[PDB]
């Protein structure tokens, strides 16, 4: 039979230290092609190893299509092919777009759904998985208003995380590295920062906050590990909840939820399943 393996790379939609992501075309259908730098080969190997262990299939997990390794003259080329989400990342989306109560809840419940699916062990099934780099750039927006979680290059089954999103126990090196639940609790911290980023863009009583990344007001751009440790661990700062949220029942409930993702004590934080249940009772 014919194995049509050609992908037409049409436009670059992301470029970083990781490498590049392209919109591509296979048999008339859009795909996303992540081309890895030499620098970040181990991210391709880890995501490939995970998908070779468990073929994750969930509406709120970026859809896997293929892992490709091609021999070149002097190098190895590593591609990850996935579903293509033309609306781009949540980070991208929140820059110009504002949300209402329905769209805000749909976004955050879809993220919680994807995260709970990663975290849960299913017997007969899937191993439990922690993401370890959850942030708004690693979440894609779908046309139906739900999101999907991307980038399992740091995932662990039962490179470091983006420093801005690191939990206190990562920054102070107290994380119980032999305990899988520790890595879940690091994801929940990061989830709470994403929830704050999204909630800011939800309009209430004619008011919205501008898009800002977590800790924009207390660390530099490209904060150092030390910058983050002093804010999060030493001073125990947390993102600001604006007064205007306390006039809106949805943002009042979301403020309480994000507080319960940011406890210094990792074992006090809510689980992804408890976050879903709380979100299904809002509105
Ligand atoms: C190797 O590499 C690439 C392959 C492909 C590709 C292209 N046409 C058809 C296929 C195909 C799928 C599955 C079967 C099955 C049929 C049932 N039978 C019992 C077992 C075998 C056969 C054929 C594939 C896998 C695309 C690629 O790009 C997206 C590839 O490169 C990453
Ligand atoms: C990787 O991704 C894509 C793959 C394909 C694709 C191409 N040829 C053949 C197949 C296939 C056929 C038949 C089986 C069999 C397996 C065992 N049993 C006998 C029942 C079913 C499996 C696989 C597929 C899935 C199409 C795609 O899109 C239209 C893909 O997505 C980009
Ligand atoms: C986070 O990580 C990965 C993401 C993706 C991915 C999947 N769908 C769509 C995208 C995308 C498309 C388009 C835009 C822009 C361009 C046009 N307009 C001006 C605004 C929107 C941005 C983003 C991406 C980047 C694939 C990945 O792997 C193949 C990723 O890595 C795991």
Mapping DSSP onto H, E and C, the string for 104-140 reads HHHHHHHHHHHHHHHHCCECCCECCEECCCCCHHHEE
- For the sheet containing 8-15, what is the strand order? 8-15, 19-26, 29-36, 76-82, 64-71
Q: CA 236, CA 30: separation in Å to the nearest integer?
A: 45
Instruction: Please indicate whether residue 68, judged by its CB atom, sits closer than 6 Å to ligand 2.
Output: no
Cα torsion through 20, 216, 96, 116, rounded to 10: 70
Residues 151/135, Cβ–Cβ less than 8 Å: no
Resolution in A for the shown PDB structure? Answer: 1.3
How much of the chain is helix, strand and coil, in % rounded to 5? 40, 20, 40
Instruction: Please indicate whether residue 87, judged by its CB atom, sits closer than 6 Å to ligand 2.
Output: no
Query: Quick check: helix, strand or coil at residue 90?
Result: helix
**Cα(85) to centroid of ligand 3, in Å?**
6
| Token pair belonging to 223 | 């904060």
Query: Quick check: helix, strand or coil at residue 9?
Result: strand
- Testing ligand 1's pocket by substitution, the residue of 4, 24, 71, 78 carrying the most ligand atoms inside 8 A of its CB is 4
- Helices of type H across the chain: 41-53, 90-96, 101-119, 168-171, 180-200, 225-229, 249-259, 272-280
- Testing ligand 3's pocket by substitution, the residue of 150, 153, 154, 194 carrying the most ligand atoms inside 8 A of its CB is 150
**Cα(169) to centroid of ligand 3, in Å?**
30
Q: CA 141, CA 91: separation in Å to the nearest integer?
A: 9
Instruction: Please indicate whether residue 27, judged by its CB atom, sits closer than 6 Å to ligand 1.
Output: no
Residue from 230, 247, 210 nearest 166 by CA: 230
CA distances from 118 to 17, 113, 204, 270 (A): 26, 9, 32, 15
Annotated binding-site residue? 192: no
Instruction: Please indicate whether residue 66, judged by its CB atom, sits closer than 6 Å to ligand 2.
Output: yes
Burial 83-96 (b: 16+ CB within 10 A, else e): bbbeeebbbbbbee
Q: What are phi and psi of 111, to 5 degrees?
A: -65, -45
Q: CA 152, CA 40: separation in Å to the nearest integer?
A: 13
Q: 57: which DSSP letter?
A: -
Q: What are phi and psi of 26, to 5 degrees?
A: -125, 120
Place of tokens 């979680």: 149
**Cα(3) to centroid of ligand 1, in Å?**
6
Residue from 131, 153, 149 nearest 140 by CA: 149
Residues 254/111, Cβ–Cβ less than 8 Å: no
Residues 169/182, Cβ–Cβ less than 8 Å: yes
Residues 91/147, Cβ–Cβ less than 8 Å: no
Reading phi first (left if > 0) and then psi (alpha if -120 to 50, else beta), residue 50 is in alpha
Question: Which burial class, exposed, middle or buried, applies to 169 when counting CB atoms under 10 A from its CB (0-12, 13-18, 19+)?
Answer: buried
Residue from 175, 183, 51 nearest 130 by CA: 183
Instruction: Enumerate residues 6+ apart whose C-beta is below 8 A from 204.
Output: 244, 245, 247, 248, 250, 251
- As annotated, the active-site residues are 133
Annotated binding-site residue? 21: yes
Annotated binding-site residue? 31: no
Q: CA 118, CA 130: separation in Å to the nearest integer?
A: 6
Query: Quick check: helix, strand or coil at residue 165?
Result: helix
Q: What angle do CA 197, 109, 164 make, to 5 degrees?
A: 30
Q: How was this structure determined?
A: X-ray
| Token pair belonging to 236 | 């125990």
In sequence order, what are the beta bridge partners of 257? Answer: none
Q: CA 93, CA 91: separation in Å to the nearest integer?
A: 6
Cα distance from N-terminal residue to C-terminal residue, the chain: 54
Residues 43/138, Cβ–Cβ less than 8 Å: no
């Amino acid at each position: 039979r014919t194995v049509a393996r050609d992908i037409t790379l049409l436009e670059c939609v992301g470029k970083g230290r990781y490498g590049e992501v392209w919109r591509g075309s296979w048999q008339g259908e859009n795909v996303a092609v992540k081309i890895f730098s030499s620098r970040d080969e181990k991210s391709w190997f880890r995501e490939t190893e995970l998908y070779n262990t468990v073929m994750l299939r969930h509406e709120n997990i970026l859809g896997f299509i293929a892992s490709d390794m091609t021999s070149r003259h002097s190098s190895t080329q590593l591609w990850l092919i996935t579903h293509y989400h033309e609306m781009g990342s949540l980070y991208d989306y929140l820059q110009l777009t504002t949300l209402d109560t329905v769209s805000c809840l749909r976004i955050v419940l879809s993220i919680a759904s994807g995260l709970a699916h990663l975290h849960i062990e299913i017997f007969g099934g899937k191993p439990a998985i922690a993401h370890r780099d959850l942030k708004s750039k690693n979440i894609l927006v779908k046309k139906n208003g739900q999101c999907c979680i991307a980038d399992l290059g740091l995932a662990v089954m039962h490179r470091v995380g983006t420093k801005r999103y690191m939990a206190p126990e990562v920054l102070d090196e107290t994380i119980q590295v032999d305990c899988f639940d520790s890595y879940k609790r690091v994801d929940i911290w990061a989830f709470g920062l994403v929830l704050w980023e999204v909630a800011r863009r939800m309009v209430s009583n004619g008011i919205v906050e501008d898009y800002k990344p977590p800790f924009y007001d207390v660390v530099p751009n490209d904060p150092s590990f030390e910058d983050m440790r002093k804010v999060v661990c030493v001073d125990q700062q947390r993102p600001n909840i604006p007064n205007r949220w306390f006039s809106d029942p949805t943002l009042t409930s979301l403020a309480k939820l994000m507080k319960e993702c940011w406890y210094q004590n990792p074992s006090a934080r809510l689980t992804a399943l408890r976050i879903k249940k709380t979100l299904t009772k809002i509105d």
